[PDB]
Amino acid sequence: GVESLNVLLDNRSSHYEEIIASCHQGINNKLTAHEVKLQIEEEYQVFRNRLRKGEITGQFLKVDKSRLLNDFNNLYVDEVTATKDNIEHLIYQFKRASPILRFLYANIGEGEERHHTIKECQMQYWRSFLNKVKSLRIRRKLLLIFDALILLASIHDQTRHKCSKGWLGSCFISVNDRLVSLESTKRDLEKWVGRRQQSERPPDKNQILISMFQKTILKATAALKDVGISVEHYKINMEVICPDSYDLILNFDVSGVVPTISYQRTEDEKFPFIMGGVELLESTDLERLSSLSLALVNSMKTSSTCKEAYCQEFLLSGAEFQLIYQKTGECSKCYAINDNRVGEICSFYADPKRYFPAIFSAEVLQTTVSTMISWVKDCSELEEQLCNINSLTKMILVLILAHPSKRSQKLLQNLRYFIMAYVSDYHHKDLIDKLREELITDVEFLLYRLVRALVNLILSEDVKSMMTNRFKFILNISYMCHFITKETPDRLTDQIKCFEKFLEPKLEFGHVSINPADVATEEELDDMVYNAKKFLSKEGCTSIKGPDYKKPGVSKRFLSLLTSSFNNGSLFKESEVKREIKDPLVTATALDLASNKSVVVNKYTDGSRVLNYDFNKLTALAVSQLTEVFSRKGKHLLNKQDYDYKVQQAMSNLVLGPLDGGASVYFDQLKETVERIIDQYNFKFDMGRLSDDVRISERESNSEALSKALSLTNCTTAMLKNLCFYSQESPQSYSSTGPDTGRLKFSLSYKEQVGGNRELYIGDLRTKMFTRLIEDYFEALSLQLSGSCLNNEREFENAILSMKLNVSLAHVSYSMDHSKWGPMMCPFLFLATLQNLIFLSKDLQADIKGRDYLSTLLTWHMHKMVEIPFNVVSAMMKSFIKAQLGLKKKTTQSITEDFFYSNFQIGVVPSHVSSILDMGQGILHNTSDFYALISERFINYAISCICGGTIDAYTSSDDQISLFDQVLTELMQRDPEEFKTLIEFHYYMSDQLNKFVSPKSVIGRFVAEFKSRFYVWGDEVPLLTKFVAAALHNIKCKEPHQLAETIDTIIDQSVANGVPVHLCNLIQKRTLSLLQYARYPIDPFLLNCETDVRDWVDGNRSYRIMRQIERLIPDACGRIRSMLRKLYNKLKTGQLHEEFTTNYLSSEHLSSLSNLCELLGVEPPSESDLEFSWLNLAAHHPLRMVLPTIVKTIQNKLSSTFTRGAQKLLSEAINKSSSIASGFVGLCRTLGSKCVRGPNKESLYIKSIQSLISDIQGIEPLIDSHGVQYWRVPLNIRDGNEGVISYFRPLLWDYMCISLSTAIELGAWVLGEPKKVRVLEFFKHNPCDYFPLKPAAIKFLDLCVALDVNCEALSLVSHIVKREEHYIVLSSELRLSHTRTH
Ligand SMILES: [Mg+2]
Ligand SMILES: [Zn+2]
Predict the structure, then answer these.
(1) What sequence ranges are listed for the domain RdRp catalytic (predicted)?
(2) Contact yes or no for 741/17 (Cβ under 8 A)
(3) From CA 548, how far away is CA 56, in angstroms rounded?
(4) Which residue of 206, 405, 1042, 1217 pairs with 1038 in a disulfide if CB–CB is 3.0 to 4.6 A?
(5) Distance in angstroms between the alpha carbons of the first and the last residue of the chain
(6) How remote is the CA of residue 471 from the centroid of ligand 1, in Å?
(7) Ligand 2 centroid vs 112 CA: distance in angstroms?
(8) Counting ligands in written order, which one lies closest to the CA of residue 813?
(9) Per-residue DSSP letters for 327-351?
(10) Residue 117 CA: which ligand is closest?
């Protein structure tokens, strides 16, 4: 599917050949393998001679540790002036930085009063009951009758044991976590009952209240009994309605501290309690932080619904505090902390999200800090000052967790580059200027001081004993950056930076074409030709001035040298000379485009498509938005006599209509546009219509776009060609710019990355099909050769082996990195390189045809159009319109803003941007990889033919590791002035080919780093912090059986790198505790929290559940565990194979199990062993997460090769249907609403099933220590009551079938005997030692296929369609493991 372009009518008259002539004029790609050496030698000679005198700059220095340390110490001396800070002062001032940090260390607490808090009175029960009633459907009447009952309950329960919990001053929380007063409600009730009494005018003032209360109670009970849930299980005392109720309310008195939140800075400088009394050694502050973070996260449940107040209670070591806020939704707001004994402890302005990683993780952090400290305790010279390290690490962790910012991420992230350059031999001089950020708040400077004090302590100039544990310590500290987030604080603020990045390098080159208009103008062609000519006019090392680094452009001489060298077979190894280069022209599916991405749809008002924005509508929208944002803010904080208010009021009086020494002309001419707009169509028109009209290219999802495109064809195959060249809407002829359907179009977006933010170009569908052809072509042609690791898997292992071998012999390594790889490449370079290669085959015609098709495709991509986001245009228009008659801000005028202004004050406004110096970021990956491979091979060959050494390369897109040989390493130690100039020539000659080296490169003899894989001599570097941070906040709003396997895979992957097993057990326990908060009945299938090391390296997922089940009921699986051995012995040989498949697989379960046990001459299981059962919800239909799967997956994988099957799959995917904390809130809310499917048709609850089980007095629950519920039921109740026993499932049958399947899928050591060995002696061990290990590696196939459908609790075949190769584990964790005989 490469030569299908011959179906269209060619039209390539005049524009096409000029570019070819420009790119093929002076490229002498015919040199031999003997002339290039002369040019290379002469270039080397002239470069060295010019460098010796000093007309060229080096950009490479020799490492000196003292200067590096001093420069790091003196890195921020403009606001933080100091020389050395004492640890005691840092500790003293750390506990008093911010209210959040001051609250976690105060001396708070109270005896028996805190013991009463372990009890719940008759006040919260009524609150929960009324919340449940209000959840269903049954207006001030309801609120009054609902918040009076809880008041009555509190009054009743305040005269029995003298306790008042759930109060604040004179306020009480009633229904929606609200805060309501006392007197106002009393008088409202009095007036409402007075109106009732007036309407009734024998009845008394105490009878109407009880009558209405009982009228509501019966309706509530009927409503709860209608669905199927009981009412008497809530434990509510109905006697709270006293006979004398009306007079009870009106004679109540109470006294307390009146609460009030603050909004300024000077109101939080008064602290009631002691400012600090907690030591860092214990884990007291972590529990408080966890509770506060949970309270903050829970603050998003509130719906829309004096004025308002919302509250959330939380306990702390007996005490009870309340977090109060005054605005709903999910965004930045004001929070205050209150108590009932004092008032307004503190107040802050935190954000509800970005607070997930600390919810129930209070012992994982302590353990990881302990295991990080345990890495350096064996240093003789670092014995005295050991507690300071622990304290500093604790402060760093607590500070990063308590104040999640974005500029604190870039500070801990850059320490890795410094520590990599510390143990190296050479480094770029522009390295210090790269480790510098812009800090604003007073907290980040404290973090910088803390990390500086820690680095100056760990890396002093008098300790050289280990020199390996400190490296791991610093590198793992630098990886705490992953603990915060990967989201973005704002949206508009981070959308202008991307546009400025996109437009910055394209303006200096002086080539910015704004509006192509889809019919190219003569000036556009002339400018494109001139820029193409200019792009190939780079000179260097042979001129009057010399080279000019860091500029876009390519030299003709080096391009000719590269092409000639490639065409002579001089860049090939000894294995490629045994064959001939193949052309993939003659040697795919379209459903791939249905992936989980986005797409853009066009819009036509006529035969043509709109491409330009309107001017008057944009002005009207800008004025409307300014008035909208003004109406509230400028009405309060603007002086009436001020000019700004006087002019903004006039501006507001232009659209709504409910001293001019400034811009009189502008204000006089702006009236007409608004008047015409309002005449042409509480505003005076429709905002929605205007917003829809101004938008030109709305977005749309991916699946339905493909479905609607496919639903108008007549081909019975799902191929790429059938959707593009054959349709009712297909191009007829194609021209120089593009097909008659129009030129290509893209749109801009940003990714979500830790640190910076990458670009993203998202195109339409036609471009999506067009790109894949070139993508696949270049991918195959690069796969022909060896050297690329972008998609390969084995060469990555080969590179790892090479790195290990190089490090083992102390050879020199070079870790590289290229900058601006995306926004400064060009498709013209690819076209010019393609037009000079010789894919030698004995067929000229096919080569010419393929080259022509590739050339025209590259030309099509050369004339692409790029869209400008709507929000950026709106913001720029607001800035222009406001700062033309007003004087509001006018602070900074960036060079990227005058570009909008100059075009604004000419008439039409910018719509698109087109140019030549931009390559699609993440679009043409394979072409760039292939070019990089060729260029690196040529550079290595040149360096080889200059000096007497050889160099390797493992380039992958933009990354590189280079491994020098022995000769270069020996040369580096005896002639530094030669090695340095060789490096200089390498840098210059790499720059000459449009490849720029970043200042973060390393030339080291101690560590190698390729794709974030550090290697040293002997030891290994486990990124424990990265894995822990990734595993912490990695849950979504899925069904609770997919999260278990999602976390299990992550833990299995992380175990194989060096993480101990106790951390994994704690993480799994935290996950189970998080699930328990949602009140989900745990089954013995989710997770196992007692795994040893053999359960991760030898056993698979199915073995851990087997081990967990083997512990719940012992002495009952032993009988089965020998019948299974006999069955395996008689089945592997081929004895029976008949009745087990049909007479024992599809029948009654218990009877068949007993018969199977009896048949093999083995004692049948005891009668009191089949009584064990477990509850399995959704045993009939799957749960409703939104408000046989094996055969269906096989169908979706095979029948989707045609049109109808693919369409059905797309329809089902469409009919399937923000944050991480929002996902948790959604999971908590959804799991508990209905989440139940009935037998025939209905929706039920979870509480109803529990009530039904509690009703029958024959079922007994059993709980494990961590908590896994499993039931015991008698055989006599096996049937007769089938209403609820349907959901239960037996235990021994599933255990047997899963054990048999696991024995089939692995060896036979599983059915041995578990004899946990622990009689081994003791040893003072070291936490730094590792041992590589390997895994434990027809009728059986269809046997497993048939067995898969019966025991439907897991999906074993799902895990098949990766498998880890080697496992690296400690030595002390490898001994104490279970052992089993064959
Ligand atoms: Mg790298
Ligand atoms: Zn009480």
Answers:
(1) 802-997
(2) no
(3) 10
(4) 1042
(5) 55
(6) 18
(7) 12
(8) 1
(9) --SSS---EEEE-SSSS--EEE---
(10) 2
Geometric angle at alpha carbon 1018, from 1014 and 1023, rounded to 5° = 35
From ligand 1's centre to the CA of 955, what distance in Å?
Answer: 10
The neighbour count for residue 784, using CB atoms within 10 Å, is: 13
d(CA 289, CA 336): 15
Q: How was this structure determined?
A: cryo-EM
- Is 724 annotated in a binding site? The answer is no
Distance from Cα 1128 to the centre of ligand 2, integer Å? 62
* Cβ contacts of 602 within 8 Å, gap of 6 or more: 609, 697, 745, 764
| Residue 818 counted as an annotated binding residue | yes
| 110 annotated ligand binder | no
To the question of whether residue 331 is assigned a binding role by annotation, the answer is no
The greatest distance separating any two alpha carbons of the chain, rounded to the nearest whole angstrom, comes to 123
- In the reported structure, the alpha carbon of residue 1011 is separated from the centroid of ligand 1 by a whole-number distance in angstroms of 5
Instruction: List, in order, residues 6 or more apart from 146 with CB less than 8 Å away.
Output: 130, 134, 174, 175
Q: Is 147 annotated as a binding residue?
A: no
Q: Kindly identify the ligand whose nearest atom is closest to the C-alpha of 158.
A: 2
CA of 243 to the centre of ligand 2 (A): 23
Q: Is 963 helix (H, G, I), strand (E, B) or coil?
A: strand
Closest C-alpha to 947, from 990, 978, 993: 978
For the record, the structure tokens of 230 come out as 């009981």
Provide the residue ranges of all domains of the chain, joining segments of one domain with +.
1-56+487-613+696-868+911-992, 113-249, 614-695+869-910
CA–centroid distance, residue 1008 to ligand 1 (Å): 10
Is 171 annotated to bind a ligand? Reply is no
Residue 799 Cα to ligand 1 midpoint, Å, equals: 13
- Helix, strand or coil, per DSSP, at residue 1182: coil
Token pair belonging to 894: 């960036």
Give the ligand with the smallest distance to the CA of 1008: 1
Degrees (nearest 5) of the Cα angle 1256, 1258, 1261?
Answer: 100
Distance CA 4, CA 85 (A): 73
Distances, alpha carbon 541 to alpha carbons 290, 561, 653, 945, 1317, in Å: 63, 16, 67, 19, 73
Q: How far is it, in rounded angstroms, from Cα 1286 to Cα 1273?
A: 13
Give just the sign of the alpha carbon dihedral 1037, 1043, 1049, 1051.
Answer: positive
Query: How many angstroms separate the CA atoms of 50 and 57, rounded?
Result: 10
